[PDB]
Amino acid sequence: ETYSSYIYKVLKQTHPDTGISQKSMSILNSFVNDIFERIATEASKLAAYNKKSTISAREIQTAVRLILPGELAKHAVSEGTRAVTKYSSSTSRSAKAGLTFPVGRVHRLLRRGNYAQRIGSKAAIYLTAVLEYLTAEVLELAGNAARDNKKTRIIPRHLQLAIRNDDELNKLLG
């Protein structure tokens, strides 16, 4: 429900240049929740459809293809595939997967909302990488609208401008 600190971390990894206001963070935090709900729900119906007791990374991946607009989908799938692949060859979970967002908190969230009987680990890693990639994407576009306008602080107007002036962001967050 609160990815704030991790959102702020993500922002500084690419643009220490840029700050973000309270309103902007809560709005951006709500987008993370909405995207989580819609992905978990779709994976939930997919698990039931394929007679699965457990939501695995496979259900997460398919759910990502369906919910996300064209280009965002292929990049999210690539990132989710990267986080799970790195964590496997490496045998915290976030660190092993190379993620900044809390893999443990997401798994738990997935787990206490009863989308399935069980939530596999690789699936929680997959979803976490997707939430992080998307969050960075919004921050990048919300940040570009701020920096292009010669400002150094993301305000709510910039989020609206980023989502509006971008087609795929528009399909998803519109």
TrEMBL record:
Subcellular location per the Swiss-Prot or TrEMBL entry: Chromosome; Nucleus
GO molecular function: DNA binding; protein heterodimerization activity; structural constituent of chromatin
Keyword annotations of the record: Acetylation, Chromosome, DNA-binding, Isopeptide bond, Nucleosome core, Nucleus, Ubl conjugation
Coiled coil: none
TM helices/strands, residue ranges: none
GO cellular component assignments: nucleosome; nucleus
Principal cellular location given in the protein's record: nucleus
Positions of the Core Histone H2A/H2B/H3 domain: 1-66
Its biological purpose: Core component of nucleosome. Nucleosomes wrap and compact DNA into chromatin, limiting DNA accessibility to the cellular machineries which require DNA as a template. Histones thereby play a central role in transcription regulation, DNA repair, DNA replication and chromosomal stability. DNA accessibility is regulated via a complex set of post-translational modifications of histones, also called histone code, and nucleosome remodeling.
Family: Belongs to the histone H2B family.
Assembly information from the UniProt record: The nucleosome is a histone octamer containing two molecules each of H2A, H2B, H3 and H4 assembled in one H3-H4 heterotetramer and two H2A-H2B heterodimers. The octamer wraps approximately 147 bp of DNA.
This protein's name: Histone H2B
Organism: Saccharomyces cerevisiae (strain RM11-1a)
Lineage: Eukaryota, Fungi, Dikarya, Ascomycota, Saccharomycotina
